[PDB]
């Protein structure tokens, strides 16, 4: 529920943008940056999952 | 000089030379020679390079033919404030001035 959908979807392409670039460039310095893009995508994925976790089971009830 | 070596040289006019085959034991040239050593602006670093390093020299426009083989000869007086430079790094090939680290 909530932002978790979009925050996941925004990540799912960025992660796809990362790994693709990783399989494009050879072993090089830019492969490091490709790894960083891929990991940023994974982080936004988990960020979406964690806001979903908070929405499913709130523990700070009153805003 | 051997390769990658340095020596400070001064101007020595032919008249005030008393060495070699011309050596006269009773010719007092010391005063003028020392008077040439103590000139403010006439000490020059003569540098013999390695052949490998003489390949990658860049010549200045107009100073094309100044070298004589491996031998180059720069002025020892720093262009900043005029301390003797005198710190010739034999591998990095950087002449260094101790006064302010040029």
């Amino acid at each position: 529920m909530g932002k978790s959908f979009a925050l996941l979807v925004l990540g799912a392409i960025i992660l796809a943008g990362g790994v693709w670039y990783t399989i494009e460039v050879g072993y090089s310095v830019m492969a490091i940056v490709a790894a960083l893009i891929m990991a940023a995508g994974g982080g936004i994925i988990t960020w979406g999952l964690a806001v979903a976790a908070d929405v499913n089971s709130p523990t700070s009830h009153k805003i | 000089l051997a390769a990658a070596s340095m020596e400070t040289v001064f101007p020595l006019p032919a008249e005030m030379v008393n060495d070699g085959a011309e050596y006269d034991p009773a010719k007092d040239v010391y005063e003028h020679q020392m008077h040439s050593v103590h000139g403010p602006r006439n000490a020059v670093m003569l540098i013999r390079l390695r052949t490998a390093d003489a390949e990658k020299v860049i010549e200045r426009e107009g100073q094309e033919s100044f070298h004589y083989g491996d031998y180059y000869a720069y002025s020892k007086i720093c262009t900043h404030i005029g301390c003797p430079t005198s710190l010739y790094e034999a591998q990095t090939n950087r002449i260094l001035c101790p006064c302010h680290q040029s």
Binding site: - | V37, H38, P40, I81
Partner: protein, 54 residues
């Protein structure tokens, strides 16, 4: 009890020779340090030049 300015091992002055540690006295080191930290900005104007030490 402490030696200061042991001139006898410096030798007489001649303009072709210099040492690695050749700083001025302590109270002048500030005006040495300025000359060490200036980034070599020098002006050329036709027949004239303002050196980097101005």
């Amino acid at each position: 009890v402490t030696t200061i300015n042991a001139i006898w091992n410096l030798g007489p002055y001649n303009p072709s020779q210099v040492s690695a540690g050749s700083q001025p006295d302590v109270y002048m080191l500030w005006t040495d340090g300025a000359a060490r930290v200036m980034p070599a900005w020098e002006l050329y104007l036709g027949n004239y030049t303002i050196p980097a030490v101005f």
